[PDB]
A paper describes a structure:
Sodium and aspartate symporter GltPh is an archaeal homolog of human glutamate transporters, which clear the neurotransmitter glutamate from the synaptic cleft following rounds of neurotransmission. Briefly, the transporters are homotrimers with each protomer consisting of a centrally located scaffold or trimerization domain and a peripheral transport domain that harbors the L-aspartate (L-asp) and three sodium (Na+) ions binding sites.
TBOA and TFB-TBOA blockers share the amino acid backbone with L-asp but are decorated on β-carbon with one and two benzyl rings, respectively, that cannot fit within the confines of the substrate-binding site. They block transport by binding to the outward-facing GltPh, GltTk, or EAATs and arresting HP2 in an open conformation. In the OFS, the bulk of the transport domain remains mostly static relative to the scaffold, and the labile HP2 serves as the extracellular gate. Interestingly, HP2 opening in the OFS, as seen in GltPhOFS-TBOA, and the IFS requires displacement of LipidOut. In the OFS, when HP2 closes over the binding site, LipidOut fills the space between the hairpin and the scaffold, and when HP2 opens, it displaces the lipid and interacts directly with the scaffold. The nanodisc is nearly flat in the GltPhOFS-TBOA structure, where the hydrophobic regions of the transport domain and the scaffold are aligned.
Numbering used by the authors:
A (entry chain C), B (entry chain A), C (entry chain B): 2 to 416
């Protein structure tokens, strides 16, 4: 009876209920020193939810890209790829520019209270751009599906789908039956993955409550004081990023942004809580399929953009760079923010397949200015920033996924 | 001609012939110092047989669980799971209790002849129960199928099968054809695996002869003397475990135990020789399919129980703990055997996915009593036990697999 | 327009054009000290081509061996296997014999100008033959497909194909539909892989130009002088190997060698440039499919022979061993070249699954003579050889692949 009442209750209402009571119970138990208790008792439910959403990432990206490449190969896919790459670079530049502006409006960093403490161990720089651009072609397709590797799986699935499309028009009548068997089996795998992510989103409110309860419990207390200016600057920059870039881009290309948010509420909240833009790829592809977009556009612009397009990470990089520059008391050489913008774009395009990309992206952005992370002062101020990393990480993951959904909708409306 | 005479000869007769001549030639060549010669020459045939049976473990557990979850999902699978978990915990408790009784009837351990020798390097304890209970959900399904991981493969196959069952009743007529293609391909993979394990069991007598020849050659000589009481206590406890637990449980639920043994002779002997309960999973699933049990019961209670239900290991843990307690000359505090029973059950339930589980299970069972494995005396007595590990390991693997077959038959007769 | 002119231009003409201008521009830029510039700028296109051809290696070897084992299992596959193993051992013996003769005709090694320099770190010897012969059966099929392992994939695909062939003749009518679904899906995967390798060979001239430009740029300058005798001896031995073994073997079994070369031009040139005999397996299987050979012969003798049959490596082993023997000024004990021939055959058969097999093959061939690689003089002379390793590696990979194509054609003409 009560289980039937819980299932038949709508999903977005209980997601909001879990979010609100998670924030309340998290701040209350963080205010009273019960951090280790909630960390050992409640956080495993959120870890289970994150692992349940990371389970479906690789089969859905393989299967509904093999069946997603049943579109016209020289006309559609090339134009969609070049348009979505141009879009991703443009919005990353706009996002880091707006982050620089939002950090220049506030004054984050006044007091000098830095002890040396624990410093960063010279964070290892990115591999050369040739090696990362050669990472896209896989040496083994099963070895690319076996551990991560979203970009080699994208490449292999695209090539297999184009080959199957060329295969099903052959003059033979056995090769046609073989290819129409393989395509139907892979399509069945994709539809099974969507039917699973329906039930995972049915489970989602418990994990949302647990995750944001732990986040607002451990790092919900350390946010008051000087770091509140950093949190306010990042969050105001992210909401102004949405309302002044994505709304303008949807009003230019003639789709209602309110109906767009009414659709993408699911993936936006799941990416806000889950704190991993690659771990909400099944929810993003589900909400793109329910938005009325053909497979050959969303199925390629979403898993590509979950690895390249990081807008909220770029805005946090700009705000963190300006906070490090104010902590040491530098003028920061007005006109050299073009180097910050350029390196924030080139770091996103040149750290595609590398795991742990955000840390070395922030490292090379700080290194291009003149504050390398081997200095003890910048390491102390960055360690002071890192205590509230999750509170900024939630919002920047939400904007990182909303960017992908907006770009997919723009390219699909254009084509 | 002679090859046709070898193939058309029945399988159980040549399995018994290979077993008997393997035991005879093993004791003879162990009595005469030809241990290294038989170890280098004859043991590779048994290693080839063990690898041939370990090849079929992961595809059959994936495929005939995806097609095995074509039963009613809320009614059948939940009741089968909770009943088989209750059964496994109950028989593990009964087995370690009977092991304590059988060690208390005998007097294993009289002489104190322990030098320090080579001692155990503080065997690393189990991971926390939250992490092992979170291991069940996989972060990657292909990464769970790629190296071991019977429990994440069980979880992913169950969820995929329930999704396909929900999928084949949809109102669409393309999704139905896609799902009925995928299910038929996976069913073809399962039937191909059973057709392979037929021929592997045809090969099996050479590997049985080689394996038990090496086992009775290297550790068939060190069994006489004081350790013969340990071997007799373990083997009498295992046969009394079978004849006084499984026979009573089959006579309660109304199936003939003699016909049950006449069926399960194949998997019992293969698990007796192969010395790996996970490596005789295809033979166990084949003999459960030939026993007339539907897929939704045997296909889930066998690979789950090949990782959790260890009855013979629990009985050997009880007997080894009592032997360590008699070797140091302790009273062993009558009434504290409840802690031995409780930790032998909780160690089985809390060391599910860990590889090398039996060593750290025995370690924590010895640690809960008051004889931790860092002491030199208990390390010397355990190193004296370890010389006859294979002779006990054969019988305890046989009882470990017969427990799974009995529990599957009980749940299938009930449902 | 120009892209249409590039695509519609024939493939072998632009492959020869890229080869010739690659050799010319490579020698010119190597003569002028522009080695690092061409290494950083042009070599990545060849690396991209090599990775594009290594992508298709594992799915095509799995898929068109599962569908390739739809032949009569006891009659065809056993005779084909034993005939191709006999062929591979015989031509490896002939190749190392002709290498010994060709090194004895020339006089490679006159001057003694060896400093100690950088020496080999006692190159680790091969695993025991039992362990390498047990490597053929996989402990995990998905773990064998996940990283390399051509031989366990061959074994698992053969067993799965024989099981499907036994399955499709069963009296059931659901198992037949399941097996005919699985076989058609795997056949669709194989045909998709061939349709991909068509386009990869369309891309191939850019990679051919880049690869041979870098090879003739870095190690095209160090070839003149004393090492030119080594290069001439190796290349004359390889062309005499082809024209006096493979032409005689095709004229004995009654097929025209000129039409055979007119077919196998594609795989011969791709193996000549790519410098990896396992990385031109899709081109070899494509040219064997276009040569009119049934699947059950080429599909098994090509991926097996890409791991065992190394004829050009055997000839280079003989010539390098004789060069090391002339560098130290030894008589080399006429009549002990039987040990060189025997160890060059047994090293090929006993280092099958090991990665990095050629180095330890040359190591054990040098060790069986009396010049172990721990001596400083032989390490200095081998380090002097290693400067022109690529120039010999191109031709010896070409002969290594032409051996497989010749043996497949002989067994297919016989059967
Ligand atoms: C607690 C630990 C739970 C660990 C596992 C949690 C979630 C695993 C979800 C796997 C999904 C199985 C795939 C089948 C599926 O998704 O079907 C879906 C079934 O939904 C479910 O199974 C949800 C079950 C999650 C239960 C979460 C915990 C319940 C606690 C109740 C407490 C109430 C107070 C429905 O799909 P549909 O398209 O809406 O069908 C329409 C009507 N037929
Ligand atoms: C020695 C080293 C051997 C290494 C490989 C050993 C075993 C690999 C087994 C692979 C099985 C191939 C799958 C096909 C299969 O299982 O079919 C099965 C064929 O059986 C076999 O192939 C058995 C062959 C094993 C030979 C073992 C060594 C023979 C030595 C003879 C010496 C006599 C003295 C029969 O299936 P069925 O359902 O009973 O069919 C009914 C009538 N058609
Ligand atoms: C530059 C970096 C390029 C990186 C990717 C390079 C190659 C990837 C090749 C993937 C193949 C896709 C599978 C589809 C396929 O193979 O179809 C094939 C399509 O062919 C292609 O796509 C070749 C495209 C390679 C372009 C190489 C670079 C072009 C540069 C032009 C410069 C001219 C001066 C044709 O197959 P068919 O059997 O002959 O069909 C008969 C008529 N329909």
């Amino acid at each position: 009876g009560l289980y039937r009442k819980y299932i038949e209750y709508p999903v977005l209402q209980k997601i909001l209920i879990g979010l609100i009571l998670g924030a309340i119970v998290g701040l209350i138990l963080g205010h009273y020193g019960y951090a280790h208790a909630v960390h050992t008792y409640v956080k495993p439910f959120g870890d289970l939810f994150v692992r349940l959403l990371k389970m479906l990432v690789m089969p859905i990206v393989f299967a509904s890209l093999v069946v997603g490449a049943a579109s016209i190969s020289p006309a559609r896919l090339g134009r969609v790829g070049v348009k979505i790459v141009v879009y991703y670079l443009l919005t990353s530049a706009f996002a880091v520019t707006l982050g620089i502006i939002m950090a220049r409006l506030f004054n984050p960093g006044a007091g000098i209270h830095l002890a040396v403490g624990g410093q960063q161990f010279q964070p290892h720089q990115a591999p050369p751009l040739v090696h990362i651009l050669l990472d896209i072609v896989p040496t083994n397709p099963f070895g690319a599906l076996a551990n991560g590797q979203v970009l080699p799986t994208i490449f292999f699935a695209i090539i297999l789908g184009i080959a199957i499309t060329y295969l099903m028009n052959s003059e033979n009548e056995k090769v046609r039956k073989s290819a129409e068997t393989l395509l139907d089996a892979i399509n069945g795998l994709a539809e099974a993955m969507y039917k699973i992510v329906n039930g995972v989103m049915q489970y989602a409110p418990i994990g949302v409550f647990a995750l944001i309860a732990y986040v607002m419990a451990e790092q919900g207390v350390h946010v008051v004081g000087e770091l509140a200016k950093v949190t306010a600057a990042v969050y105001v920059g992210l909401t102004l990023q949405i309302l002044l870039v994505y709304f303008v881009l949807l009003k230019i290309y003639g789709i209602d942004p309110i109906s767009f948010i009414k659709h993408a509420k699911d993936a936006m909240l799941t990416a806000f809580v889950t704190r991993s833009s690659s771990g909400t790829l099944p929810v993003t592809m589900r909400v793109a399929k329910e938005m009325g977009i053909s497979e050959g556009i969303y199925s390629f612009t979403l898993p590509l953009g979950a690895t390249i397009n990081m807008d909220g990470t770029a805005l946090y990089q700009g705000v963190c760079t300006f906070f490090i520059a104010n902590a040491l008391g530098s003028h920061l050489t007005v006109g050299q923010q073009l180097t910050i913008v350029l390196t924030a774009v080139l770091a996103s395009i040149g750290t595609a397949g590398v795991p742990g990309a955000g840390a070395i992206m922030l490292a090379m952005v700080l290194h291009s200015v003149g504050l390398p992370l081997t200095d003890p002062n910048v390491a102390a101020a960055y360690a002071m920033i890192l205590g509230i990393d999750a509170i900024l990480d939630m919002g920047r993951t939400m904007v990182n996924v909303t960017g992908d959904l907006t770009g997919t909708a723009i390219v699909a409306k254009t084509e």
